[PDB]
Amino acid sequence: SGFRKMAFPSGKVEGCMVQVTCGTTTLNGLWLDDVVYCPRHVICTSEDMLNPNYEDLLIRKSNHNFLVQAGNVQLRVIGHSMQNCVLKLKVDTANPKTPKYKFVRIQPGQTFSVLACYNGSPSGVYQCAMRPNFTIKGSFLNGSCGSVGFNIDYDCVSFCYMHHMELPTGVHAGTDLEGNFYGPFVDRQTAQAAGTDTTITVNVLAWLYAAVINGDRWFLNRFTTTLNDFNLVAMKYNYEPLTQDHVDILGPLSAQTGIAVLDMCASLKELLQNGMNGRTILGSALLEDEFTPFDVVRQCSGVT
Amino acid sequence: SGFRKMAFPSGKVEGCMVQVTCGTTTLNGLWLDDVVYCPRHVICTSEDMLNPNYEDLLIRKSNHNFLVQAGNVQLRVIGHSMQNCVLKLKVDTANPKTPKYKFVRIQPGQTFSVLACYNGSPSGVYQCAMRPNFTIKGSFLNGSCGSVGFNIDYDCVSFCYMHHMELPTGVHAGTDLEGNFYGPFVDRQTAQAAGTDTTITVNVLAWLYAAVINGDRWFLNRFTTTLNDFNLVAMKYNYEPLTQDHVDILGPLSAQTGIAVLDMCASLKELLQNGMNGRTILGSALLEDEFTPFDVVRQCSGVT
Numbered sequence: 001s002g003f004r005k006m007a008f009p010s011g012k013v014e015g016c017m018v019q020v021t022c023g024t025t026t027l028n029g030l031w032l033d034d035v036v037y038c039p040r041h042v043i044c045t046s047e048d049m050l051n052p053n054y055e056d057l058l059i060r061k062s063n064h065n066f067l068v069q070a071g072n073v074q075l076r077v078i079g080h081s082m083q084n085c086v087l088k089l090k091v092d093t094a095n096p097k098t099p100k101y102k103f104v105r106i107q108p109g110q111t112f113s114v115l116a117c118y119n120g121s122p123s124g125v126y127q128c129a130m131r132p133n134f135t136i137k138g139s140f141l142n143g144s145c146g147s148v149g150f151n152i153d154y155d156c157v158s159f160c161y162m163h164h165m166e167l168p169t170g171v172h173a174g175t176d177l178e179g180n181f182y183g184p185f186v187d188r189q190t191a192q193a194a195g196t197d198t199t200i201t202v203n204v205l206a207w208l209y210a211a212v213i214n215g216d217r218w219f220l221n222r223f224t225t226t227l228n229d230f231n232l233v234a235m236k237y238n239y240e241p242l243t244q245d246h247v248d249i250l251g252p253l254s255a256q257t258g259i260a261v262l263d264m265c266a267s268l269k270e271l272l273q274n275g276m277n278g279r280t281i282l283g284s285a286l287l288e289d290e291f292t293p294f295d296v297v298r299q300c301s302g303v304t
Numbered sequence: 305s306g307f308r309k310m311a312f313p314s315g316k317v318e319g320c321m322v323q324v325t326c327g328t329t330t331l332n333g334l335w336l337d338d339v340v341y342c343p344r345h346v347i348c349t350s351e352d353m354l355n356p357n358y359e360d361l362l363i364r365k366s367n368h369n370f371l372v373q374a375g376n377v378q379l380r381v382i383g384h385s386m387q388n389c390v391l392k393l394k395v396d397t398a399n400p401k402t403p404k405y406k407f408v409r410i411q412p413g414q415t416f417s418v419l420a421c422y423n424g425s426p427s428g429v430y431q432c433a434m435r436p437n438f439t440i441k442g443s444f445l446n447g448s449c450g451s452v453g454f455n456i457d458y459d460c461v462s463f464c465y466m467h468h469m470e471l472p473t474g475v476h477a478g479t480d481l482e483g484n485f486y487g488p489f490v491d492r493q494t495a496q497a498a499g500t501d502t503t504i505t506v507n508v509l510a511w512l513y514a515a516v517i518n519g520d521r522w523f524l525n526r527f528t529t530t531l532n533d534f535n536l537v538a539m540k541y542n543y544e545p546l547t548q549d550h551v552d553i554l555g556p557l558s559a560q561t562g563i564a565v566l567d568m569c570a571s572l573k574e575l576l577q578n579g580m581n582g583r584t585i586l587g588s589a590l591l592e593d594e595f596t597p598f599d600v601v602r603q604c605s606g607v608t
């Protein structure tokens with residue numbers, strides 16, 4: 001027993017991280033097969049970032065201007081193309097450590113692990129969630145751009161995020177591995193404010209089920225609710241609306257614990273209305289929303 | 305910017321995990337050079353765990369009774385010995401993925417990453433701290449025994465924990481890599497209650513410095529205190545006493561932020577006495593104590 005914020009083992013992704021330098025800008029790249037993926041702003045100087053014309057800046061670049069280093073060895077760049085906000089640098093050597101992989105575009109509320117890197121070297125791994133406003137609350141310092149987010153299904157890595165930006169409010173923005181930003185963000189140092197960071201309701205319910213499974217049951221009340229009544233309270237607390245699809249996805253946790261989804265919703269409603277009263281749930285004084293229903297099942301069952 | 309509970313990249317440790325089976329008991333082992341380390345209770349049946357005589361149980365075991373599997377290949381066991389609460393199984397093949405490593409016995413309050421495994425396969429990685437009562441609050445299901453805790457210093461892995469037990473209260477106990485339990489715990493299914501889980505004061509102060517560095521400054525008050533005055537309040541709140549060694553270790557964070565250690569202590573004192581008043585610090589409604597001063601520096605500077 002015990003429930004922890006857990007990241008996927010990062011080894012498979014550590015074997016893909018490379019350093020990419022263009023001129024005086026250095027960041028991280030992802031080396032899969034004979035292609036290195038990195039944020040296109042590797043071609044910008046800090047001055048260019050204020051209002052960059054990427055196509056124009058790229059005209060002044062050749063294969064030999066992109067310096068790719070894997071460990072302490074240099075990779076030969078034999079091609080380069082821009083796809084949305086990422087550059088794909090074709091190299092002459094397929095990464096020998098390429099794991100089975102996919103590129104997926106996740107939905108808000110979905111969680112993933114990030115392997116924070118600096119100069120192509122992994123520094124740490126943590127678990128994130130794509131917020132409903134399409135930002136992520138990460139930990140990224142200068143040099144961390146190009147670090148990726150991913151999920152693992154047995155031996156296949158689904159890459160879902162690449163780090164590009166930090167908004168003026170300290171939250172983070174990035175793209176999927178096709179270079180499309182999540183949300184309305186752009187790779188330009190301009191006024192980009194995030195929308196409401198609402199709470200991922202279905203994740204909070206999944207985490208309340210994990211708490212019950214691990215012994216924390218004090219918050220279970222004697223009430224039930226309906227989706228409509230619950231959602232009126234959820235709107236008031238800046239919680240995402242709960243749908244019948246969310247109820248269906250919580251079905252296995254409802255079955256394992258014997259607590260109906262709408263009963264857990266009523267417990268959540270009372271926690272929102274009355275507060276925690278100085279108490280904790282799974283060692284937290286706030287309702288955790290960065291565990292999906294699948295993460296709860298995986299951790300509570302032992303998926304490897 | 306941004307501050308996250310971060311684990312070390314786990315690849316170096318993933319390359320060491322093996323499955324160890326003795327009879328009908330299966331758990332995880334750590335394969336370093338030509339030795340596989342695993343909890344000695346791999347020789348017990350669930351019945352034996354109530355009052356095991358390990359020396360006696362081991363007499364009925366031979367090299368061929370310990371089945372070690374690395375991936376889908378079997379390792380040949382050519383020797384076996386018991387060292388405290390671990391078995392060391394000498395194998396005929398040195399692990400080709402053995403990283404640079406050390407075995408260290410950590411002190412309470414020190415943090416480390418755990419790579420949770422099942423049947424020798426990594427499932428996830430999370431950050432832990434050795435509690436002042438020598439337990440850890442982990443996430444461990446049946447089959448996770450033998451999963452290890454570690455820290456990384458550039459390319460050297462310092463292994464500090466091996467999982468062995470879950471106490472009746474759901475908290476965890478284990479040993480260093482020489483087989484010595486942390487705390488007074490034993491590998492027997494008996495009444496073992498943990499002592500007071502006090503808060504690691506020096507870690508809370510380090511995390512308050514991380515909050516200041518990342519913009520969360522609301523809790524900074526207009527007061528100072530002394531170690532003696534602070535410790536009187538800390539005792540009342542089940543916080544570990546703060547020593548001059550703790551003050552010295554916080555020195556670099558004090559220097560970077562310009563906030564004297566005893567000023568941060570006074571801010572912490574007011575947070576303990578007045579509560580958070582529904583506010584959060586680095587997205588938490590309670591004071592986080594599972595970041596050491598070194599972890600804060602490492603994350604706030606980008607150590608790889």
Ligand SMILES: *[C@]1(O)C(=O)Nc2c(C(=O)OCc3cccc(C)c3)cccc21
Pocket residue numbers: 026027039041046047049141142143144145164165166189
């Ligand atoms: C990523 O490429 C990265 O790793 N750093 C980074 C920055 C960055 O460091 O911003 C500092 C900066 C930039 C522009 C103007 C000033 C005053 C400061 C920015 C964007 C993308 C990345």
Ligand SMILES: *[C@]1(O)C(=O)Nc2c(C(=O)OCc3cccc(C)c3)cccc21
Pocket residue numbers: 330331343345350351353445446447448449468469470493
């Ligand atoms: C580790 O070896 C491990 O992975 N599991 C485990 C257990 C365990 O599964 O406990 C279940 C159990 C044990 C004894 C009696 C009953 C009723 C149930 C126990 C100790 C160590 C380990």
